[PDB]
């Protein structure tokens, strides 16, 4: 269902700090027409932390409605509050999302029993497929392979993992412990290539917001086993993958989009800021030039 | 205003998962009568992450009402959403809190510019004193000393720090950069003794929920400069400090209070769980009995 | 020159704690005849830390003489003492080694200028090609890509890197900064597969000591672009890669060899010990059974 | 036997890269006359890693000879090679050292069983008191409290710890597990103050090489229980402690001694370098002048 290049969509805002619905719809349309194979609205790159409950639901509804069955929609239903995660997940199901992205809880640092209770509670409350989002660079705690495999064995609707660790030996461990039917998606753009050769089938991507066509061509080459061409694409994309997280990626991505001439405002929500250092903007501009996408 | 032993209060719940208002009031009154010098409602140990906005506000209101001016109240007023932080902060001010505890944002990892924007926006929105809560073991990012000093220099109501790093060299750096008038409180029970000799004047404490009298005695000895006596208390308390975070301290504290005969249910909100391993309960019971806390 | 599967050779010892020269020769012969493409004597897996200067030179001499030009020999010349590294490197050159493996200095933690001085001093003292061995899990410090690229640009005989980080995004960075002529070898068995698709051409391997034929077949499949078959080999080898570093790999490898019936004693040198936990030996035995190599 | 301020002595070298025996003797005599209470020759700050066996021995012999029983001498006698450690330890005993400093092995990462074998073999080979030097920021592995206690319980001449973690909670854990008779010395200048209030009785110090009198005064105030006075010294010394490890402290200490007019050359052995950035020298000079150390 989910494969190849899947943007973790930004959430654009107006000058007045409302959801810029027309910008969001346009970005989704453009993503689909440039070759993105799926959509993740209201994830981390979507600024889930600074959306109200209502706005989070609106972002998911609007992504589901816009996509209109053309590509599958994996709605962000992440929080560190299990009851709220259930409510987000049930809203996503009822509005027509195809799957759920559920982050390992951050900040309050549950132990293994707490992870089983969190993901089990969600799995019991919805019938949609659930993807575990493992990102210890943000959550501190990391779901281990034994816990992942136990969840996969216990609950039919826990089907996959967004693996943002960038440690691809884990892709092999997860493939052996959970089975080759388990859907593994990279959550780290710069190691997505190696992640797929170890068993992954796609990438939930920051850079795809900015360069959807080349990211789609990159993932197509991997799926066809043209790993020579995929490396050629890797070498062209890697400087952009890296430039987009010199400073926080949500600000960096929106800057890159405006420099491409897209209808996306620079506005982000505190504690994120839109101001980038001169050297950061130049690193992004040169990485975009290097993929032609700008100057050539 | 804030000094010696200050519990980061638990938020007790009923078997029906409502706020146990009677248990909360009794806990505060017991804490005061045993020597706690101040109160922090709706912090991390207070399960702020699993409280709704209205419950969080109600916990703060109740704590202010119950303290009745006997001890100062530092309300938890911080999330990783600046607008929500301002809303919790302004509620706390209008209901009569004496100060605010504002955590460095977790999960979404702002950069230094974002920290200045976050803490600056909160400081401009209230007139109450603000304490920066630095806990990188939960937030991943760490506010550095230059940023902390800039905030103190820029905003007159940014007045202190909850320093939960456990790296007491930072106490010396913050004392020099921010001034000896900057109020430093330990956020790490096990290193609170050294923290104070480096410049701190108290501890926002997990263990004080369980053992408020001995924790108050420990801090009193420190403020009297009886460091020999403070080290004897340290040796009695350290095993309990340590046993309470074998598993998440929220669950462990409520287990301990229940065992001591306090009217506190075991209930916690997912992803916390109340089930503890037997080896964990055994370690807690041994540390409680070494101190001599069972009335029976 | 160096490609595919290259064992970091163990150094066998007799009951009496001398170098077991006949065992070493036999292990080398067996490695070559099973398909290993190169040899690294007196590296980390070779217990370089507990060899005398004389014994280190003897191990390199004996590996060079045994190999007799059939496969290339990359001699360990690593220490955290630059003068001693020069002496080891010059001995290796004079005895007929084909290249040098030079670890980033451990324990004394030089800064970037110190790394330039260390690797530059060695590059000036020999004409052999030098491979940088980056392993911060043992050295704490990590050579960054700018430093690596500067060394490669400055000195003709710094030609490659043993990259033991297991973070394969670095393979892409090193490929772009140092050029595709730069020889990158994985130093992490479990991520070797993804490391090669990102630009690597081989692996300096622990597991190859134990399963040289399958490791050689694994690397052959990668070099032929049969990444489907390589993944099949990965899934068979990964449990053995992981089982060999539950406890220190030098002890684990020698245990595995004796369980295969090879003439290798269990003896290691303090502070390493030969005693393995029951659960460790069983994890290794099952991983060997899973590659048939034992039971079938 | 060991208490208050104990420099980890630098090893000065000549322009020809020989041991500057005259400079070393003058440094020791100056350290004693300024209040240092003991001496550690041929430790980390003494560039043990770049000394030959015969130079290391000569540094220890000279330090013992020069101290002339006025202050005790704790010889560096530890590498990551147990047999070499025994040889350095036995030399130190036979030349008249009072105790031994034995680092947890670096680079080759023994497990707990290996630590027991390492420290046990050394303890059985000498009758001198042994101090465990725990410095995971250099060794990666960290001796845990259970292992330390087992060693103290098993070997009567394992008597104390050099604890360079900077995590003073470990001081409380070691005091409880090993006994209040276990001698704890800080290995981290910046946290030495809190370390002592948690149970320590002195500091094996980098900064004491540069500022031995004020460091001795600082430690004297602590042992007198004048913690208010100790905090005033902390505030004066902390900027110097910090400035001396902007770049490797070996280079920074010799730079500072040279600037103060001591007969100590700048020479260091690769991979250390004597060249410091101007911003580093400026920070050191400012911290030296804040204390008032320039005679001119």
Automatic annotation (TrEMBL), chains A, B, C, D:
Its main location: cytoplasm. It catalyses: L-aspartate 4-semialdehyde + pyruvate = (2S,4S)-4-hydroxy-2,3,4,5-tetrahydrodipicolinate + H2O + H(+). CDD domains: DHDPS. Signal peptide: none annotated. The keyword Lyase applies. Keywords: Amino-acid biosynthesis, Cytoplasm, Diaminopimelate biosynthesis, Lyase, Lysine biosynthesis, Schiff base. Pathway: Amino-acid biosynthesis; L-lysine biosynthesis via DAP pathway; (S)-tetrahydrodipicolinate from L-aspartate: step 3/4. The keyword Amino-acid biosynthesis applies. The active site is at residues 133, 162. PROSITE patterns: DHDPS_1 (PS00665), DHDPS_2 (PS00666). GO terms for molecular function: 4-hydroxy-tetrahydrodipicolinate synthase activity. It is found in: Cytoplasm. Its EC number is 4.3.3.7. Pyruvate binds at residues 45, 204. One of its GO terms (biological process) is lysine biosynthetic process via diaminopimelate. It is an enzyme of class 4 (lyase). Pfam families: DHDPS. The record marks 44, 107 as: Part of a proton relay during catalysis. GO terms for cellular component: cytosol. Transmembrane segments: none annotated. Homotetramer; dimer of dimers. Belongs to the DapA family. Catalyzes the condensation of (S)-aspartate-beta-semialdehyde [(S)-ASA] and pyruvate to 4-hydroxy-tetrahydrodipicolinate (HTPA). This is 4-hydroxy-tetrahydrodipicolinate synthase. It comes from Candidatus Liberibacter solanacearum. The gene is dapA.
């Amino acid at each position: 269902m989910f494969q190849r290049s899947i943007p973790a969509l930004i959430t654009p805002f107006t000058k007045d700090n409302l959801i810029d619905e027309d910008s969001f719809v346009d970005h989704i349309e453009w993503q689909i027409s440039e070759g993105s194979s799926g959509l993740v609205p209201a994830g981390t790159t979507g600024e889930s932390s600074t959306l109200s409950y209502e706005e989070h639901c609106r972002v998911v509804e609007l992504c589901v409605k816009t996509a209109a069955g053309r590509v599958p929609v994996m709605a962000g239903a992440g929080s560190n509050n299990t009851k709220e995660s259930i409510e987000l997940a049930q809203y996503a199901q009822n509005t027509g999302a195809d799957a759920l992205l559920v982050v390992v809880p951050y900040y309050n640092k549950p132990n293994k029993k707490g992870l089983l209770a969190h993901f089990g509670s969600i799995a019991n409350a919805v019938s949609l497929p659930i993807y575990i989002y493992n990102n210890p660079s943000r959550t501190v705690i990391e779901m281990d392979v034994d816990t992942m495999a136990e969840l996969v064995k216990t609950y039919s609707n826990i089907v996959g993992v967004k693996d943002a660790t960038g440690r691809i030996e884990l892709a092999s461990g997860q493939r052996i412990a959970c089975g080759s039917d388990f859907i593994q998606l990279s959550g780290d753009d710069s190691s997505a290539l190696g992640f797929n050769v170890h068993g992954g089938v796609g990438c939930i991507s920051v850079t795809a917001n900015v360069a959807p066509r080349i990211c789609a061509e990159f993932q197509k080459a991997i799926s066809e086993g043209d790993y020579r061409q995929a490396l050629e694409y890797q070498d062209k994309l890697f400087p952009l993958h890296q430039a987009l997280f010199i400073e926080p990626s949500i600000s960096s991505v929106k800057y890159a989009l405006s420099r491409l001439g897209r209808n996306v405002s620079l506005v982000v929500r505190a504690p994120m800021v839109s101001i980038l250092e001169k050297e950061t903007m130049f690193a992004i501009d040169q990485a975009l030039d290097h993929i032609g996408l700008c100057a050539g």
